[PDB]
């Protein structure tokens, strides 16, 4: 069941739910989006193909030629990722498109091809996404963050009684096309219906009704239910449907069928409707007051005179009834209105409508759009038909049409991108229905309303925006004359494309600098879902509702992982199993549940479909048949958790950990923590510094292998085989005999990135975790990245903690750390800096970088080499000279004042055409020697790999063992062997070698063409030299180190070993935390991890006992087998009887420091299992031991909690925070001290800190803090000469920023002066 390379150390998986869908590739959104961008799409709807098909063919306006598009191809990048980062240039591929310019001849009729030319034109270099999701843009790895924006479609909304002071809600409906003018309907405070476009002048909705060839009769037919009146011999026989009377008040003698049904003064009851239908009553006799205010539907003309009696939509009257009666009218049609359920929101608009026919409505629209420009008849009709009903100038996208049809309860999710008449009709009908009382408005926080714009879509949109300018230029050049001498390169320019692509990738609001101080930090920064950026809301104009988690977030967006401060819930992070739909919406997987069986088919439900079905809870106890154990199981129907039946459920959650993100699913015992403290725990787990020696967590979740593998930090084997050669800088894998390809047999070589710097100035390196000659398999890790142990994420150390107050040294949130923690160097972290010294081309010529500097002794120049550059490996401190440089008339690059370090790498760049010094050549020949060495080692090891396989096929068919080395390995071809498929392999395998003999001759020359070539530089700089310093910050009071459950705190004292509280066995506690942080800050999960960490180290202290004294492996195999048992029906179920008797002593060697424990996010180890695990080891089962004082030597009362909490070390080091300044540089425009730590600047005594000096009586302290200390230039030099002269006294005067304010106010037409 297990591989060979997981048996090194298998984590004891707790947890009870079997997994039916494994955790997907965590970087799926980035790679899938940029794969939909750069791929040939035969259907032509994704990425570059969609853009080229949307723009091309470009037809000229003259009418003779067009430029059509054939295909495209991304060329090989000039460099690859490593030297793209080294030189500081983009890792991009050159786009090469095959354009096909036709030429139509003038003499022939319309459409005839004189000539047609074609060439592959280069247009723009587009950046390439790396193997992970990162873009190397200018030598700095950035990440484009997926956006969460408003989807195109139709949106019914309302402003909840917050306008016009009427206390009334005004419902509106927007139609938002992907490309076109928006169409807004809204309700007036008088219940009128009003239409506007682009928020122009507000028009009645009947204007756009009449614009679609609708008379008043058809409008009232559409928007109203008819009531028939039948004038007869006796008194207004009106047909009356019984359920039309609900919610109405009787006002007359309601009598029918010879029965007095309802008397006046009554509300019409339900049983009245029941009896009126039970007696089957349809026609009623009513008085004439019931027609005194009704509205006629259609027009009624006299059948003889032919004159208009009553117009359409007129209020009937007594004499009007007489006039229709005298004209032989029998059926009279009125509109069914109401005060509650059917308002007259259309009739009132028609009475506000200042038009009467189609043409007046179109002219009113025309005058609304463009004031002035006197209307004509085509100028209005063509404008309206091209406004909403033209494919060229209006387009709902596929997602737009999908949302449009889905919100209107249609079924066809596809159709025309333009608006239809029935579409606008349905929008008005739905809006009037919302106003009526049925239905609800749409909330924009819903994830079925917000849409993901990942890397590929935004880049493609920016590419198309840049391509519009190009097609304008091409159409211009085509429309100019004399086309027969042209080619598709003179008209098309790559500068708009490259500009609009490089501007988006380089400097945008969503293409942002990568956080790179963890594998976790990278892999979770590539999965943010930002609600900001272009086309999105503002950071500081966002309300309380979009910032809050919505019931739709379940399974798509994590609810606990989000930053705190200025933007909570605007930088939301993806969940674990969350995917992006075909249309860009977020969707989450669910097991399809049949009649009673929880099956194993997985359907990915989107955010809109999830409200229709009912979904069970993640942890509902099913047992061996998919049958639920209960009959009242907790489920979610539509944003409402509640208990439903057993045979009602339609879906079940895939796993308990699909609600949380990837960083918040690394927290053990998450279900015991609070939500605030879990938020802090995730946000601080993203910031841990990778320490010197990575150390696994004893208590984990098992989501750490997935994080350390899916992130690209670890070097992972591609094809299984045998490790032929392990070095500190490379791993060589001899591939197996089946996975190896027939042509280009070869072997695998992995180069390990050594001590290079990351973005956050941490050190990232890869270290081999495989021995020599170990069988590795496909997908298995070979080299640990930064802060991973055996290919699983290990952000910090796991350390023996005690929860007790210790003499106030852990008072509020502080931490008391043993000195053995510093002695073991287990929090010492490498920090690599980069210092650049440039050579500007200035007046009096450029500057030399030689060592000859005035006013420096040999004590300063003792470290520089002969050419003025610091020696590699020279331990420099603050204030030394790294690269000497002189002023043309002391411009030497100094170490920053406070940092130390060992210079580990010097990189020198030179312009194309500058003579280089000996140090640049000293690097150059050493760089070039490796290039010869690496390719020869690439070849001769592969040469050893070919001839070994050439010898391998010599096991049969031509076997002469002695003859193979009568002549050397070169000629194993013309030897005696039967000319068959076996001899075909010899001429095939050596053909690769002959190809490699041609690979050697051009590749090494190409690497010569790059090493000595002049690198591209900025205009003005002539040569750049870069120095790298590796610094080991160990630990000290002031450093901020935190745990995994949101319990931060600065280390306060480094207290020696003898002062630590030891137990009854002599082992000193490493860290003494405070108990008072547990009740208030409700992170109980830090205590169970402490108990489970102590239990985990209990197993590692009994395996150490059985290994320190040598015991037979039958004892070790017995105990380790018991330790992987004792779960309450857990799913792990390992078997030590299948281990080959040397994979146990290799397993028990990795378990001698504590057996690792997997605690899944909501399938945690129950408290009864923690005690039982504490009982297998001989530890006490209460989790608390008797702990002795370290100094007085006597026993602490009240036995205290000890255990092994896994403590991180955050990237807020007190070395980088401590600042001080007495006097320094000053700002130019205002004579005040500068601001910052890089600039040697002073603190800001801000406005809010001045009030606290006026609130005292400190009037002399306040005066010196804003005249003498800060601003007044003529009295602060007098102060410095007074402080040194032993005279503490100020002569302040007037601040220099007041005189700036006078000169600025006087720079207007405002005279401000000072009086007597």
Partner RNA sequence: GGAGAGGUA
Judged by CB under 8 A, the chain residues 398 through 427 that form the site for other proteins are: none
911 binds RNA (CB under 7 A): no
530's contact among RNA, other proteins, none, with CB below 5 to 8 A by partner kind, is: RNA
Q: Which of 357, 441, 445, 365 is nearest to 187 (CA)?
A: 441
Q: Which of 349, 337, 290 is nearest to 316 (CA)?
A: 290
Binding mask 467-506 for RNA (x = CB under 7 A): ----------------------------------------
1266's contact among RNA, other proteins, none, with CB below 5 to 8 A by partner kind, is: other proteins
Q: Which of 1035, 1072, 1189, 1086 is nearest to 816 (CA)?
A: 1072
Options 162-170, 847-855, 871-879, 1227-1235: segment touching RNA (CB under 7 A): 1227-1235
Q: What is the DSSP letter of 1092?
A: H
1020 binds other proteins (CB under 8 A): yes
Binder of other proteins out of 807, 984, 1067, 1182 (CB under 8 A): 807
574 binds other proteins (CB under 8 A): no
Q: Which is nearer to other proteins, 379 or 860 (CB)?
A: 860
Q: Which is nearer to other proteins, 322 or 1302 (CB)?
A: 1302
Helix, strand, or coil (residue 1265): coil
**Tokens 């259609």 belong to residue:** 298
Options 337-345, 507-515, 933-941, 1105-1113: segment touching RNA (CB under 7 A): 507-515
Q: Which of 1257, 761, 864, 827 is nearest to 1036 (CA)?
A: 827
592's contact among RNA, other proteins, none, with CB below 5 to 8 A by partner kind, is: none
Binder of other proteins out of 446, 464, 1221, 1278 (CB under 8 A): 1221
1234 binds RNA (CB under 7 A): yes
Q: Shortest distance, CB of residue 148 to RNA, whole angstroms?
A: 12
684 binds RNA (CB under 7 A): yes
From residue 990, alpha-carbon distances to 67, 734, 740, 742, 944 in Å are 48, 18, 16, 12, 12
Q: Which of 432, 425, 426 is nearest to 343 (CA)?
A: 432
Q: Which of residues 675-734 bind other proteins (CB under 8 A)?
A: 675-676, 679
How many CB atoms lie under 10 A from the CB of residue 1001? 9
Q: Which is nearer to RNA, 676 or 992 (CB)?
A: 676
Binding mask 158-197 for other proteins (x = CB under 8 A): ----------------------------------------
How many CB atoms lie under 10 A from the CB of residue 690? 25
683's contact among other proteins, RNA, none, with CB below 5 to 8 A by partner kind, is: RNA
Counting other chains too, the contacts that 445-448 makes at CB distance below 8 Å and 24 or more residues apart are 445/545, 445/546, 445/548, 445/550, 445/552, 446/550, 446/552, 446/607, 447/550, 447/552, 447/553, 447/556, 447/557, 447/585, 447/586, 447/607, 448/552, 448/585, 448/606, 448/607, 448/608, 448/611
1242 binds other proteins (CB under 8 A): yes
With a CB cutoff of 8 Å and minimum separation 6, the contacts of 1006 are none
Q: What is the DSSP letter of 687?
A: T
Q: Which of 647, 645, 604 is nearest to 626 (CA)?
A: 647
116's contact among RNA, other proteins, none, with CB below 5 to 8 A by partner kind, is: other proteins
Binder of other proteins out of 282, 1235, 1273, 1277 (CB under 8 A): 1235
**Tokens 């489920």 belong to residue:** 635
HSE at residue 128, side-chain half, CA atoms within 13 A, is: 18
485 binds other proteins (CB under 8 A): yes
Q: What are phi and psi of 657, to 5 degrees?
A: -105, 25
571 binds RNA (CB under 7 A): yes
Binding mask 542-561 for other proteins (x = CB under 8 A): --x--xxx---xx----xx-
Binder of other proteins out of 1030, 1050, 1107, 1176 (CB under 8 A): 1050
1310's contact among other proteins, RNA, none, with CB below 5 to 8 A by partner kind, is: other proteins
Strands (E), 1042-1172: 1051-1055, 1071-1073, 1157-1158
Q: Which is nearer to other proteins, 226 or 1191 (CB)?
A: 1191
Residue 405 backbone zone (phi > 0: left; psi -120 to 50: alpha; other: beta): alpha
DSSP strand pairing (254-256 vs 259-262): antiparallel
Q: Shortest distance, CB of residue 1038 to RNA, whole angstroms?
A: 12
539 binds RNA (CB under 7 A): yes
812's contact among RNA, other proteins, none, with CB below 5 to 8 A by partner kind, is: other proteins
Options 268-276, 672-680, 824-832, 1193-1201: segment touching other proteins (CB under 8 A): 672-680
564 binds RNA (CB under 7 A): yes
1166's contact among RNA, other proteins, none, with CB below 5 to 8 A by partner kind, is: other proteins
Angle at which helix 455-479 crosses helix 48-55, to 10 degrees, equals: 30
Q: Which is nearer to RNA, 48 or 532 (CB)?
A: 532
Are residues 853 and 892 in contact, defined by beta-carbon separation less than 8 angstroms?
yes
Q: Which of residues 949-978 bind other proteins (CB under 8 A)?
A: none
Q: Cis peptide before 57, with omega less than 30 degrees from 0?
A: yes
1212 binds RNA (CB under 7 A): yes
**Tokens 């038009």 belong to residue:** 355
HSE at residue 662, side-chain half, CA atoms within 13 A, is: 30
375 binds RNA (CB under 7 A): no
Binding mask 831-850 for other proteins (x = CB under 8 A): ---------x-x--------
Q: Which of residues 108-137 bind other proteins (CB under 8 A)?
A: 111, 113-120
Binder of other proteins out of 375, 626, 775, 1038 (CB under 8 A): 1038
Helix, strand, or coil (residue 110): coil
Q: Shortest distance, CB of residue 1074 to other proteins, whole angstroms?
A: 10
How many residues can be counted in the chain? 1316
User: Residue 747: in which H helix or E strand, if any?
Assistant: none
Helix, strand, or coil (residue 332): strand
Q: Which of residues 1003-1062 bind RNA (CB under 7 A)?
A: 1048
584's contact among RNA, other proteins, none, with CB below 5 to 8 A by partner kind, is: none
Q: Which of residues 53-72 bind other proteins (CB under 8 A)?
A: 57, 66
Q: Shortest distance, CB of residue 1213 to other proteins, whole angstroms?
A: 9
In degrees, rounded to 5, the angle at the alpha carbon of residue 1122 between the alpha carbons of residues 1117 and 1125 is 130
From residue 1154, alpha-carbon distances to 754, 1063, 1150 in Å are 29, 19, 8
Q: Can you tell me the distance from the alpha carbon of 422 to that of 443, in angstroms, rounded to the nearest whole number?
A: 24
1145's contact among RNA, other proteins, none, with CB below 5 to 8 A by partner kind, is: none
476's contact among other proteins, RNA, none, with CB below 5 to 8 A by partner kind, is: none
How many CB atoms lie under 10 A from the CB of residue 343? 16
Helix, strand, or coil (residue 1101): helix
HSE at residue 524, side-chain half, CA atoms within 13 A, is: 30
457's contact among other proteins, RNA, none, with CB below 5 to 8 A by partner kind, is: none
515's contact among RNA, other proteins, none, with CB below 5 to 8 A by partner kind, is: RNA
1227 binds RNA (CB under 7 A): yes
687 binds RNA (CB under 7 A): yes
1166 binds other proteins (CB under 8 A): yes
Residue 1263 backbone zone (phi > 0: left; psi -120 to 50: alpha; other: beta): alpha
563's contact among RNA, other proteins, none, with CB below 5 to 8 A by partner kind, is: RNA
1288's contact among other proteins, RNA, none, with CB below 5 to 8 A by partner kind, is: other proteins
Binding residues for RNA, rule: CB under 7 A, are: 508-509, 512-513, 515, 530, 532, 539, 563-565, 567, 571, 680, 683-684, 687, 1048, 1212, 1227-1229, 1234
């Amino acid at each position: 069941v297990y591989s060979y390379t997981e048996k090194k150390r298998i984590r004891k998986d707790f947890g009870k739910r079997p997994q039916v869908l494994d955790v997907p590739y965590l970087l799926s959104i980035q790679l899938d989006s940029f794969q939909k961008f750069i791929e040939q799409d035969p259907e032509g709807q994704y990425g570059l193909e969609a853009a080229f098909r949307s723009v091309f063919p470009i037809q000229s306006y003259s009418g003779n030629s067009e430029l059509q598009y054939v295909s495209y191809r991304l060329g090989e990048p000039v460099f690859d990722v490593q030297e793209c980062q080294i030189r500081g240039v983009t890792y991009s591929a050159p786009l090469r498109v095959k354009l096909r310019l036709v030429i139509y001849e003038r003499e022939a009729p319309e459409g005839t091809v004189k000539d047609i030319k074609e060439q592959e034109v280069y247009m723009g270099e587009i950046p390439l996404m790396t193997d992970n999701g990162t873009f190397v843009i200018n030598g700095t790895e950035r990440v484009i963050v997926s956006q969460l924006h408003r989807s195109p479609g139709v949106f019914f909304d309302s402003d909840k009684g917050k306008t016009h002071s009427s206390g009334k809600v005004l419902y509106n409906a927007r139609i938002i096309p992907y490309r076109g003018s928006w169409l807004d309907f809204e309700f007036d405070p008088k219940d009128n219906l009003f239409v506007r476009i682009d928020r122009r002048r507000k028009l009645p909705a009947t204007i756009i009704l009449r614009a679609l060839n609708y008379t008043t009769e058809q409008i009232l037919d559409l928007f109203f239910e008819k009531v028939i009146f039948e004038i007869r011999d006796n008194k207004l026989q009106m047909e009356l449907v019984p359920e039309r009377l609900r919610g109405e008040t009787a006002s007359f003698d309601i009598e029918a069928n010879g029965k007095v049904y309802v008397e006046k003064g009554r509300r019409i009851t339900a049983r009245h409707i029941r009896q009126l239908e039970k007696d089957d009553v349809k026609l009623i006799e009513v008085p004439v007051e019931y027609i005194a205010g009704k509205v006629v539907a259609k027009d009624y003309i006299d059948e003889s005179t032919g004159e208009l009696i009553c117009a359409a939509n007129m209020e009937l009257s007594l004499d009007l009834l007489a006039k229709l009666s005298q004209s032989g009218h029998k059926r009279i049609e009125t509109l069914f209105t109401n005060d509650l359920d059917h308002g007259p929101y259309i009739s009132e608009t028609l009475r506000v409508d200042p038009t009467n026919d189609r043409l007046s409505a179109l002219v009113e629209i025309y005058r609304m759009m463009r004031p002035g420009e006197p209307p004509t008849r085509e100028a209005a009709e063509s404008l309206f038909e091209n406004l909403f009903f033209s494919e060229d100038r209006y387009d709902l996208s596929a997602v737009g049409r999908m949302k449009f049809n889905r919100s209107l309860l249609r079924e066809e999710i596809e159709g025309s991108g333009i608006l239809s008449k029935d579409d606008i009709i349905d929008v008005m009908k739905k809006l009037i229905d919302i106003r009526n009382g049925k239905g609800e408005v749409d909330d924009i926080d819903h994830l079925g309303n917000r849409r993901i714009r990942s890397v590929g879509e935004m880049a493609e949109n920016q590419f198309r925006v840049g391509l519009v300018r190009v097609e304008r230029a091409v159409k211009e050049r085509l429309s100019l004359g004399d086309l027969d001498t042209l080619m598709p390169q003179d008209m098309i320019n790559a500068k708009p494309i490259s500009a609009a692509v490089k501007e988006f990738f380089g400097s945008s609001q969503l293409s942002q600098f990568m956080d790179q101080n963890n594998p976790l930090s990278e892999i979770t920064h590539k999965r943010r879902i930002s609600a900001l950026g272009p086309g999105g809301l503002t950071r500081e104009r966002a309300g309380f509702e979009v910032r809050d988690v919505h019931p739709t977030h379940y399974g798509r967006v994590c609810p606990i992982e989000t930053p705190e401060g200025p933007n909570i819930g605007l930088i939301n992070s993806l969940s674990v199993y969350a995917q992006t739909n075909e249309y860009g919406f977020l969707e989450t997987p669910y097991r399809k549940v049949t009649d009673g069986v929880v099956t194993d088919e997985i359907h990915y439900l989107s955010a809109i479909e999830e409200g229709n079905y009912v979904i069970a809870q993640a942890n509902s106890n099913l047992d061996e048949e998919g049958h639920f154990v209960e009959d009242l199981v907790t489920c979610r129907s539509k944003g409402e958790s509640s208990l439903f039946s057993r045979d009602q459920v339609d879906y079940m959650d895939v796993s308990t950990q699909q609600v949380v993100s990837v960083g918040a699913s690394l927290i053990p015992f998450l279900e015991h923590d609070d939500a605030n403290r879990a938020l802090m725990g995730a946000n601080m787990q993203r910031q841990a510094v990778p320490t010197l020696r990575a150390d696994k967590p004893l208590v984990g979740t098992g989501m750490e292998r997935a994080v350390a593998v899916d992130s690209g930090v670890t070097a992972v084997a591609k094809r299984g085989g045998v490790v032929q050669y392990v070095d500190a800088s490379r791993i060589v894998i001899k591939v197996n005999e089946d996975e190896m390809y027939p042509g280009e047999a070869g072997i695998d070589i992995y180069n390990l990135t050594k001590y290079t710097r990351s973005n956050q100035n941490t050190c990232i390196n890869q270290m081999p975790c495989v021995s020599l000659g170990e069988p590795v398999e496909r997908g298995d890790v070979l080299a640990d990245g930064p802060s991973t142990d055996l290919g699983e994420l290990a952000l910090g150390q796991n350390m023996r903690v005690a929860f007790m107050p210790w003499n106030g040294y852990n008072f509020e949130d502080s931490i008391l750390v043993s000195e053995r923690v510093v002695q073991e160097d287990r929090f010492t972290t490498i920090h690599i800096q980069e210092l650049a010294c440039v050579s500007r081309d200035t007046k009096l010529g450029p500057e030399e970088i030689t060592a000859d500097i005035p006013n420096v002794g040999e004590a300063a120049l003792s470290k520089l080499d002969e050419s003025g550059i610091v020696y590699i490996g020279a331990e420099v401190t603050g204030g030394d000279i790294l690269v000497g440089k002189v002023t043309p008339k002391d411009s030497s690059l100094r170490v920053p004042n406070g940092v130390s370090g060992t210079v580990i790498d010097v990189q020198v760049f030179t312009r194309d055409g500058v003579e280089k010094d000996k140090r640049a050549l000293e690097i150059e020949e050493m760089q070039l020697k490796q290039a010869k060495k690496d390719l020869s080692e690439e070849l001769q090891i592969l040469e050893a790999g070919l001839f070994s396989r050439i010898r391998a096929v010599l096991v049969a068919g031509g076997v002469e063992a002695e003859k193979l080395d009568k002549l050397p390995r070169d000629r194993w071809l013309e030897l005696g062997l039967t000319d068959e498929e076996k001899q075909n392999q010899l001429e095939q395998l050596a053909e690769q070698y002959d190809e490699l003999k041609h690979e050697f001759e051009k590749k090494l020359e190409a690497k010569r063409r790059k090493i000595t070539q002049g690198d591209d530089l900025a205009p003005g700089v002539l040569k750049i030299v870069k120095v790298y310093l590796a610094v080991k910050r160990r630990i000290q009071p002031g450093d901020k180190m935190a745990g995994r459950h949101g319990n931060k705190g600065v280390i306060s004292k480094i207290n020696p070993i003898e002062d630590m509280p030891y137990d009854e066995n002599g082992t000193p506690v490493d860290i003494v935390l405070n108990p008072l942080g547990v009740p208030s800050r409700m992170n109980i999960g830090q205590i169970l991890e402490t108990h489970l960490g102590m239990a985990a180290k209990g197993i590692g202290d009994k395996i150490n006992a059985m290994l320190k004294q040598q015991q037979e492996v039958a004892k070790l195999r017995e105990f380790i087998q018991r330790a992987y048992d004792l779960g309450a029906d857990v799913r792990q179920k390992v078997d030590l009887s299948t281990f080959s008797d040397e994979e146990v002593m290799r397993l028990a060697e990795n378990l001698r420091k504590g057996m690792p424990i997997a605690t899944p996010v909501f399938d945690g180890a129950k408290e009864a299992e923690i005690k039982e695990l504490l009982k297998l080891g001989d530890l006490p089962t209460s989790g608390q031991i008797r702990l002795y004082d370290g100094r007085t030597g006597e026993q602490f009362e009240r036995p205290v909690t000890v255990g092994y909490m896994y403590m991180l070390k955050l990237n807020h080091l007190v070395d980088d925070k401590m600042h001080a300044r007495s006097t320094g540089s000053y700002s130019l425009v205002t004579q005040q001290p500068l601001g910052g730590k890089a600039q040697f600047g002073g603190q800001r005594f801000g406005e809010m800190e001045v009030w606290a000096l006026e609130a005292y009586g400190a009037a002399y302290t306040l005066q010196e803090m804003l005249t003498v200390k800060s601003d007044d230039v003529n009295g602060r030099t007098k102060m410095y000469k007074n402080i040194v002269d032993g005279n503490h006294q100020m002569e302040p005067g007037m601040p220099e920023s007041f005189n700036v304010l006078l000169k600025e106010i006087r720079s207007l037409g405002i005279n401000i002066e000072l009086e007597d």
